Design a binder for this molecule. Structure first.
Ligand SMILES: NC(=O)C1=CN([C@@H]2O[C@H](COP(=O)(O)OP(=O)(O)OC[C@H]3O[C@@H](n4cnc5c(N)ncnc54)[C@H](OP(=O)(O)O)[C@@H]3O)[C@@H](O)[C@H]2O)C=CC1
Ligand SMILES: CCc1nc(N)nc(N)c1OCCCOc1cccc(-c2c(N)nc(N)nc2CC)c1
Length: 186
């Protein structure tokens, strides 16, 4: 199994969600970035795997769910089986990672991408090991009820550029944003 990564789009006030939806209007190219980055495997014959909390799974509309071309794993301790359209269910992040290291999966999965939500991000971010965070900075304040956890810059280094990630400012629907990549190893 390959690298463990988080990916998120966050507003200036650290908002990632409002009532199971994005705090900001749909940004199509931002969605395209998300899709490209999470689905693109660097190894031929392998897929990436996406890990998300239950509420994140259900915040994806049925039309966009499961995230195609990726293995979809949902975290929940209430659920007894994976949601309709999902592939796997784990009761903890460690369990989900262990699952990827099984003989079944270890030969199939390249990159593991945590796609939300807050508690999943926090858990992964505060867990020793090699980890990258792919962060879209939405450069406006948007009313939110779910927030990205603090990035500890003592351990997460902002990378000066990264392949396949544009380094300049983007704009959609009058909203400016930029792509960042952070990396720790502890
Ligand atoms: N801007 C962005 O990039 C993103 C935004 N979003 C937004 O964020 C919100 C959804 O995120 P959030 O509310 O934080 O919820 P989550 O997606 O993190 O879901 C929370 C649920 O998942 C389960 N869970 C979380 N962590 C674990 C764990 N470690 N082990 C087992 N189960 C776990 C629990 O389910 P149970 O109670 O069943 O145990 C918990 O109730 C929505 O508003 C969505 O639109 C989501 C992703 C990205
Ligand atoms: C995104 C799924 C979706 N697609 C369409 N077409 N409409 C929706 N309403 C919708 O759900 C919106 C609420 C669910 O939020 C998520 C769910 C998973 C991933 C991300 C996500 C992320 N983790 N990192 C970045 N950078 N960017 C995004 C947004 C593209 C956001």
């Amino acid at each position: 199994v390959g690298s463990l990564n988080c990916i998120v789009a966050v507003s200036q006030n650290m908002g990632i969600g409002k009532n199971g939806d994005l705090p900001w209007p749909p940004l199509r190219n931002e969605f395209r970035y998300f899709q490209r980055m999470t689905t693109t495997s660097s190894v031929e014959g392998k897929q990436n795997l996406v890990i998300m909390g239950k509420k994140t799974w259900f915040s994806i509309p049925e039309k966009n769910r499961p995230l195609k071309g990726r293995i979809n794993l949902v975290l929940s301790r209430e659920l007894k089986e994976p949601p309709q359209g999902a592939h796997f269910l784990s009761r903890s992040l460690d369990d989900a990672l262990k699952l990827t290291e099984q003989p079944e999966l270890a030969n199939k999965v390249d990159m593991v991408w945590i796609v939300g939500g807050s508690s999943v991000y926090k858990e992964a971010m505060n867990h020793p090991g090699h980890l990258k965070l792919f962060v879209t900075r939405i450069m406006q304040d948007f009313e939110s009820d779910t927030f990205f956890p603090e990035i500890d810059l003592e351990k997460y280094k902002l990378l000066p550029e990264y392949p396949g990630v544009l380094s300049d400012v983007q704009e959609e629907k009058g909203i400016k944003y930029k792509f960042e990549v952070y990396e720790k190893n502890d």
